[PDB]
Structure formats: C-alpha cells, structure tokens
Amino acid sequence: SMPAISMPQKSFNATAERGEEMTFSCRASGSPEPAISWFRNGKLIEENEKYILKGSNTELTVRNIINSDGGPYVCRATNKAGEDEKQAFLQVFVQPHIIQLKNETTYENGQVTLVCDAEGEPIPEITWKRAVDGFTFTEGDKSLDGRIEVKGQHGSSSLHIKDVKLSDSGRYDCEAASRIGGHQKSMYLDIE
Ligand SMILES: *[C@@H]1O[C@H](CO)[C@@H](O)[C@H](O)[C@H]1NC(C)=O
Ligand SMILES: *[C@@H]1O[C@H](CO)[C@@H](O)[C@H](O)[C@H]1NC(C)=O
C-alpha cells in the first residue's frame, strides 16, 4: 500500500541566535514499511552536529537555530508501492536590536532630530525616554509645550525638538520592543 505520512506538528516557531533547537517528526503508514528521509533545499539531510536524526529518520532535530534555518523542511516516505511527501515549516524570529542611535548637537533656539533605527522580526516598536526625568515618548506623542514630537514607522523613530533649550541637553534612551523582548540604547544630546 502506498506510504501515508502523519505529523503531530507541521509549523514551528523559533527565535534566532538563542542556541535553540526544534524537532520535526514524520511517520508513515504502509506496506512494506516506508523509508523516511528529510530534505532541505532539495538536498538530503545528513546527520551531524547541526542536524540530529533519530528513530529511523522519523525525528529531525535542528540545533542552534539561526535565521538561515527558516523555511521548509521536506519529509519523504517511500516504499515499492509509491511515495508521499509533506513539509514541515520553521519560522525564525529575531529579537529587537538597535542598529542606529547617534549622538546629536545643536544650538540654543535651534532644531534637532534624534533618530533610532532597529531590526527585529516582528518589527519592534520604538519608545523614547528622557533620562533627567524619566519621561517617556511613544507614537505620536508630543511634549506639553509642543516643542517635542515623536514620529516613527517600520522599526524606526525620530524624536524632533523645536526651539532647543539648554536644559534639553543630556541623555535620551531609545527602547525597541516586540513580543520577543527588548533592546535599549542611549545617546547624548548636546546643546552647545
Ligand atoms: C508562531 O508564531 C505566530 C506569530 O506570532 C503565531 O501566530 C503562531 O500560532 C505560532 N505557532 C505556534 C507556536 O504554534
Ligand atoms: C556620545 O557620547 C560621547 C560623546 O563624547 C561618546 O563617548 C559616545 O561615543 C557618543 N556616541 C556616539 C554613538 O558617538
């Protein structure tokens, strides 16, 4: 009888660069006993440190998950009567990481833009925090006096200050956060 594959789980999530591993399983009914084998990118998966195969190839463990591990892994079952193929799929998430947060200067009575840029999957939300008083800015938000405004989209945010004052100087933090976690970095605004 032709091989018929069963899978407990077919879609999987993992987070990159955390030393995580996941195990895909593939079993098949059929006579004669179907032989199970796994493919990635169309090439047979051979056992090593990264890929662990157990239970006559019924279980595939991918170790030390990184972004490039994302995608389809194909389970093939074959016997003299025919073959069946099914895919397991791995979505790899990436925790937020701020990749750009520069220091800035401007002069009193001037204008300045603080820029924070972050990577991540999901795309992180960006929040700004003013060190001296711990006041936080999201969105969208603006200051009571209307001088400060936050605009941002797609994991990037600008904090814009109009009519700078000496007291605006000091540390500002960017916080990039997703369900996965968060990353915070600091820069320094010098009004001088
Ligand atoms: C994988 O993550 C996605 C996106 O958050 C979620 O919708 C899905 O249910 C997850 N799959 C799991 C863990 O079963
Ligand atoms: C901002 O803070 C000081 C300025 O003296 C410096 O040590 C630090 O590297 C600056 N940050 C950047 C990204 O230039």
* Whether the domain at 1-95 and the domain at 96-192 fall into the same CATH topology: yes
Concatenate the DSSP letters of all residues of the chain into one string. ---EEE-S--EEEEETTS---EEEE-EEE-SSPPEEEEEETTEEPPPSSSEEEETTTTEEEE-S--GGG-EEEEEEEEETTEEEEEEEEEEEEEEEEEEEE--EEE-TT-EEEEEEEEEEESPPEEEEEETTTTEEE-TT-B-TTS-EEEEEETTEEEEEEES--GGG-EEEEEEEEETTEEEEEEEEEEE-
Domain-wise residue ranges, the chain: 1-95, 96-192
Output the CA 111–ligand 1 centroid distance in Å.
43
Which residue among 10, 12, 13 has the greatest number of ligand 1 atoms within 8 angstroms of its CB, and so is best to mutate?
Answer: 13
Q: Is the separation of the CB atoms in 136 and 127 below 8 Å?
A: yes
- Confirm or reject: Cβ of 9 under 6 Å from ligand 2: no
Report whether CATH 3.40.50.1100 matches the domain 1-95: no
The resolution, in angstroms to one decimal, equals: 2.0
Q: Which fold has domain 96-192?
A: Immunoglobulin-like (2.60.40)
